[PDB]
Design a protein around this ligand. Structure first.
Ligand SMILES: *[C@@H]1O[C@H](CO)[C@@H](O)[C@H](O)[C@H]1NC(C)=O
Lengths: 49, 48
């Protein structure tokens, strides 16, 4: 590798992420968001499922 | 799911289990997903 190389010869860092589902409980979850709590009104609530 | 429930109790009885009521709080749930059929306690030696 040299810095004066062509774009087809320049170094590329590659990260491959492999996602598998196994019969064990899946623990790597995404960040669920949190809508600003509203009180004293008839609303549809979803607290931790 | 591996559920570990635990309770700490202050007792002063010498030999056997004391007679009483104490409900065990849930401490930690572990995502292990493995088969378990046997167990073994781990102790600590005293060296002098
Ligand atoms: C769990 O282990 C026991 C003893 O080795 C075996 O009889 C049983 O079939 C196993 N179960 C699973 C789901 O692997």
């Amino acid at each position: 590798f040299q810095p004066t190389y062509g774009v087809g010869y320049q170094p590329y860092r590659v990260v491959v992420l492999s996602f598998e589902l196994l019969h064990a409980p899946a623990t790597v979850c995404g960040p669920k968001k949190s809508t600003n709590l509203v009180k004293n009104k008839c609303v549809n609530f979803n607290f931790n499922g | 799911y591996f559920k570990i429930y635990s309770k700490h109790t202050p007792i002063n009885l010498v030999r056997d289990l004391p007679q009483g009521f104490s409900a065990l709080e849930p401490l930690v749930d572990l995502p292990i997903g493995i088969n378990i059929t046997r167990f073994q306690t781990l102790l600590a030696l005293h060296r002098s």
